[PDB]
Amino acid sequence: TVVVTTILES
Amino acid sequence: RDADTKIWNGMVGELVYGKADIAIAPLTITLVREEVIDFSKPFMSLGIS
Amino acid sequence: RDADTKIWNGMVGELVYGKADIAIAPLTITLVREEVIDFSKPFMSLGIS
Ligand SMILES: NS(=O)(=O)c1cc2c(cc1Cl)N[C@H]([C@H]1C[C@H]3C=C[C@@H]1C3)NS2(=O)=O
């Protein structure tokens, strides 16, 4: 699978 | 960038150091980030308000 | 693109077919143009009005 990085901002 | 140690942090660090493959995230398209990782055509437009 | 002939015209047609090196123009970043020629990052934002 592919690792999708992101951040917790509404 | 840390100014002296010259390692990237953050999500740009996760992409450079091979931890992650794609940053689908509110990452601002800047010059100094462009040189070390590719950016898409921007998916959303913004400015100082 | 020409319909039933599949030949580009115009400013995109000059870049695909090698007659021109670079387009400093009001040239809209669209899907089918991206598949044949690379675009830079946008330099103005607009819309159909
Ligand atoms: N409505 S919006 O502001 O979220 C928004 C913003 C943008 C959209 C589409 C929408 Cl719906 N598309 C453009 C795209 C068209 C070409 C130019 C920039 C990319 C490729 N990017 S943008 O200018 O950043």
PDB file of C-alpha atoms and ligand atoms in Angstrom:
ATOM      1  CA  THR A   1       0.000   0.000   0.000  1.00  0.00           C
ATOM      2  CA  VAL A   2       0.898   3.685  -0.353  1.00  0.00           C
ATOM      3  CA  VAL A   3       1.736   5.880   2.641  1.00  0.00           C
ATOM      4  CA  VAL A   4      -0.219   9.152   2.572  1.00  0.00           C
ATOM      5  CA  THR A   5       1.206  11.665   5.011  1.00  0.00           C
ATOM      6  CA  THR A   6      -0.976  14.522   6.235  1.00  0.00           C
ATOM      7  CA  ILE A   7      -1.604  16.632   9.318  1.00  0.00           C
ATOM      8  CA  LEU A   8      -4.499  17.139  11.762  1.00  0.00           C
ATOM      9  CA  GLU A   9      -5.886  20.545  10.848  1.00  0.00           C
ATOM     10  CA  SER A  10      -9.581  21.215  10.441  1.00  0.00           C
TER      11      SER A  10
ATOM     12  CA  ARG B   1      14.895  23.344   7.300  1.00  0.00           C
ATOM     13  CA  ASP B   2      16.853  23.516  10.477  1.00  0.00           C
ATOM     14  CA  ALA B   3      19.386  26.242   9.818  1.00  0.00           C
ATOM     15  CA  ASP B   4      22.564  24.395  10.816  1.00  0.00           C
ATOM     16  CA  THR B   5      21.880  20.646  10.847  1.00  0.00           C
ATOM     17  CA  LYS B   6      20.439  20.860   7.294  1.00  0.00           C
ATOM     18  CA  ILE B   7      17.835  18.120   7.762  1.00  0.00           C
ATOM     19  CA  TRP B   8      14.211  18.603   6.815  1.00  0.00           C
ATOM     20  CA  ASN B   9      11.455  18.122   9.365  1.00  0.00           C
ATOM     21  CA  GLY B  10       7.711  17.923   9.034  1.00  0.00           C
ATOM     22  CA  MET B  11       5.863  16.329   6.155  1.00  0.00           C
ATOM     23  CA  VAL B  12       8.543  17.477   3.721  1.00  0.00           C
ATOM     24  CA  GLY B  13      10.993  15.543   5.876  1.00  0.00           C
ATOM     25  CA  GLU B  14       8.738  12.486   5.689  1.00  0.00           C
ATOM     26  CA  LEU B  15       8.865  12.600   1.886  1.00  0.00           C
ATOM     27  CA  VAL B  16      12.583  13.316   1.507  1.00  0.00           C
ATOM     28  CA  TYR B  17      13.675  10.616   3.951  1.00  0.00           C
ATOM     29  CA  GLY B  18      11.462   8.046   2.273  1.00  0.00           C
ATOM     30  CA  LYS B  19       8.981   7.479   5.093  1.00  0.00           C
ATOM     31  CA  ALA B  20       5.932   8.507   3.055  1.00  0.00           C
ATOM     32  CA  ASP B  21       5.051   8.629  -0.620  1.00  0.00           C
ATOM     33  CA  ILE B  22       2.573  11.510  -0.972  1.00  0.00           C
ATOM     34  CA  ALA B  23       1.541  14.525   1.127  1.00  0.00           C
ATOM     35  CA  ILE B  24      -2.159  15.083   0.555  1.00  0.00           C
ATOM     36  CA  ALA B  25      -2.172  17.922   3.034  1.00  0.00           C
ATOM     37  CA  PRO B  26      -2.345  21.720   3.261  1.00  0.00           C
ATOM     38  CA  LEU B  27       1.315  22.160   2.348  1.00  0.00           C
ATOM     39  CA  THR B  28       2.122  25.570   0.925  1.00  0.00           C
ATOM     40  CA  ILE B  29       3.882  25.561  -2.440  1.00  0.00           C
ATOM     41  CA  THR B  30       7.083  27.470  -1.728  1.00  0.00           C
ATOM     42  CA  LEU B  31      10.419  27.823  -3.482  1.00  0.00           C
ATOM     43  CA  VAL B  32      12.604  26.042  -0.934  1.00  0.00           C
ATOM     44  CA  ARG B  33      10.205  23.111  -0.702  1.00  0.00           C
ATOM     45  CA  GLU B  34      10.017  22.845  -4.489  1.00  0.00           C
ATOM     46  CA  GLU B  35      13.727  22.186  -4.898  1.00  0.00           C
ATOM     47  CA  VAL B  36      13.739  19.057  -2.737  1.00  0.00           C
ATOM     48  CA  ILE B  37      10.302  17.538  -3.541  1.00  0.00           C
ATOM     49  CA  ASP B  38       8.001  17.946  -6.507  1.00  0.00           C
ATOM     50  CA  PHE B  39       4.676  19.723  -6.153  1.00  0.00           C
ATOM     51  CA  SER B  40       1.463  19.250  -8.048  1.00  0.00           C
ATOM     52  CA  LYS B  41      -0.469  21.993  -9.711  1.00  0.00           C
ATOM     53  CA  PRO B  42      -2.173  23.585  -6.692  1.00  0.00           C
ATOM     54  CA  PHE B  43      -5.474  22.064  -5.689  1.00  0.00           C
ATOM     55  CA  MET B  44      -6.679  25.102  -3.741  1.00  0.00           C
ATOM     56  CA  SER B  45      -5.915  28.821  -3.813  1.00  0.00           C
ATOM     57  CA  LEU B  46      -5.438  31.077  -0.808  1.00  0.00           C
ATOM     58  CA  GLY B  47      -3.852  34.286   0.394  1.00  0.00           C
ATOM     59  CA  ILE B  48      -3.316  36.551   3.366  1.00  0.00           C
ATOM     60  CA  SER B  49      -6.641  37.987   4.473  1.00  0.00           C
TER      61      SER B  49
ATOM     62  CA  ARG C   1      -6.989  19.457 -31.269  1.00  0.00           C
ATOM     63  CA  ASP C   2      -8.510  19.089 -34.692  1.00  0.00           C
ATOM     64  CA  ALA C   3     -11.530  16.803 -34.784  1.00  0.00           C
ATOM     65  CA  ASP C   4     -11.088  13.720 -37.051  1.00  0.00           C
ATOM     66  CA  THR C   5      -7.533  14.901 -37.895  1.00  0.00           C
ATOM     67  CA  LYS C   6      -5.950  14.871 -34.392  1.00  0.00           C
ATOM     68  CA  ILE C   7      -3.576  17.744 -35.147  1.00  0.00           C
ATOM     69  CA  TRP C   8      -2.948  20.577 -32.699  1.00  0.00           C
ATOM     70  CA  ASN C   9      -3.222  24.171 -33.851  1.00  0.00           C
ATOM     71  CA  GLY C  10      -2.023  27.411 -32.436  1.00  0.00           C
ATOM     72  CA  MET C  11       0.370  28.068 -29.617  1.00  0.00           C
ATOM     73  CA  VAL C  12       0.097  24.574 -28.202  1.00  0.00           C
ATOM     74  CA  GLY C  13       0.562  23.299 -31.747  1.00  0.00           C
ATOM     75  CA  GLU C  14       3.830  25.174 -32.116  1.00  0.00           C
ATOM     76  CA  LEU C  15       5.247  23.742 -28.907  1.00  0.00           C
ATOM     77  CA  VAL C  16       4.269  20.126 -29.572  1.00  0.00           C
ATOM     78  CA  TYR C  17       5.590  20.218 -33.126  1.00  0.00           C
ATOM     79  CA  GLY C  18       8.897  21.793 -32.142  1.00  0.00           C
ATOM     80  CA  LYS C  19       8.620  25.177 -33.838  1.00  0.00           C
ATOM     81  CA  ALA C  20       8.777  27.140 -30.563  1.00  0.00           C
ATOM     82  CA  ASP C  21      10.758  26.762 -27.348  1.00  0.00           C
ATOM     83  CA  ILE C  22       8.599  28.412 -24.680  1.00  0.00           C
ATOM     84  CA  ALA C  23       5.214  30.126 -24.398  1.00  0.00           C
ATOM     85  CA  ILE C  24       4.985  33.303 -22.331  1.00  0.00           C
ATOM     86  CA  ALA C  25       1.283  33.645 -22.995  1.00  0.00           C
ATOM     87  CA  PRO C  26      -2.197  33.605 -21.472  1.00  0.00           C
ATOM     88  CA  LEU C  27      -2.223  29.832 -21.918  1.00  0.00           C
ATOM     89  CA  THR C  28      -4.723  28.039 -19.714  1.00  0.00           C
ATOM     90  CA  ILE C  29      -3.507  24.986 -17.796  1.00  0.00           C
ATOM     91  CA  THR C  30      -5.983  22.289 -18.839  1.00  0.00           C
ATOM     92  CA  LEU C  31      -6.020  18.509 -18.897  1.00  0.00           C
ATOM     93  CA  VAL C  32      -5.376  17.678 -22.550  1.00  0.00           C
ATOM     94  CA  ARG C  33      -2.672  20.316 -22.852  1.00  0.00           C
ATOM     95  CA  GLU C  34      -0.791  18.850 -19.901  1.00  0.00           C
ATOM     96  CA  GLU C  35      -0.555  15.443 -21.571  1.00  0.00           C
ATOM     97  CA  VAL C  36       1.370  16.869 -24.537  1.00  0.00           C
ATOM     98  CA  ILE C  37       3.334  19.790 -22.992  1.00  0.00           C
ATOM     99  CA  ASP C  38       4.519  20.602 -19.499  1.00  0.00           C
ATOM    100  CA  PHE C  39       3.218  23.722 -17.785  1.00  0.00           C
ATOM    101  CA  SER C  40       4.928  25.842 -15.191  1.00  0.00           C
ATOM    102  CA  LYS C  41       3.329  26.771 -11.903  1.00  0.00           C
ATOM    103  CA  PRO C  42       0.466  29.255 -12.430  1.00  0.00           C
ATOM    104  CA  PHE C  43       1.348  32.916 -12.615  1.00  0.00           C
ATOM    105  CA  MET C  44      -2.163  34.344 -12.539  1.00  0.00           C
ATOM    106  CA  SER C  45      -5.440  32.940 -11.291  1.00  0.00           C
ATOM    107  CA  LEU C  46      -8.686  33.469 -13.161  1.00  0.00           C
ATOM    108  CA  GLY C  47     -11.889  31.835 -14.252  1.00  0.00           C
ATOM    109  CA  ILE C  48     -14.491  31.677 -16.954  1.00  0.00           C
ATOM    110  CA  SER C  49     -16.767  34.698 -16.594  1.00  0.00           C
TER     111      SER C  49
HETATM  112  N1  LIG D   1     -12.428  26.793  -5.735  1.00  0.00           N
HETATM  113  S1  LIG D   1     -10.887  26.639  -5.327  1.00  0.00           S
HETATM  114  O1  LIG D   1     -10.392  27.950  -5.033  1.00  0.00           O
HETATM  115  O2  LIG D   1     -10.817  25.625  -4.319  1.00  0.00           O
HETATM  116  C1  LIG D   1     -10.010  26.045  -6.735  1.00  0.00           C
HETATM  117  C2  LIG D   1      -8.694  26.448  -6.907  1.00  0.00           C
HETATM  118  C3  LIG D   1      -7.960  26.008  -8.002  1.00  0.00           C
HETATM  119  C4  LIG D   1      -8.523  25.148  -8.955  1.00  0.00           C
HETATM  120  C5  LIG D   1      -9.860  24.742  -8.770  1.00  0.00           C
HETATM  121  C6  LIG D   1     -10.574  25.183  -7.688  1.00  0.00           C
HETATM  122 CL1  LIG D   1     -12.204  24.628  -7.561  1.00  0.00          CL
HETATM  123  N2  LIG D   1      -7.828  24.689 -10.041  1.00  0.00           N
HETATM  124  C7  LIG D   1      -6.532  25.242 -10.407  1.00  0.00           C
HETATM  125  C8  LIG D   1      -5.813  24.309 -11.391  1.00  0.00           C
HETATM  126  C9  LIG D   1      -6.019  24.687 -12.863  1.00  0.00           C
HETATM  127  C10 LIG D   1      -4.571  24.786 -13.401  1.00  0.00           C
HETATM  128  C11 LIG D   1      -3.942  25.949 -12.696  1.00  0.00           C
HETATM  129  C12 LIG D   1      -3.712  25.582 -11.450  1.00  0.00           C
HETATM  130  C13 LIG D   1      -4.261  24.194 -11.276  1.00  0.00           C
HETATM  131  C14 LIG D   1      -3.917  23.623 -12.652  1.00  0.00           C
HETATM  132  N3  LIG D   1      -5.701  25.437  -9.220  1.00  0.00           N
HETATM  133  S2  LIG D   1      -6.308  26.536  -8.193  1.00  0.00           S
HETATM  134  O3  LIG D   1      -6.288  27.803  -8.849  1.00  0.00           O
HETATM  135  O4  LIG D   1      -5.624  26.397  -6.948  1.00  0.00           O
END
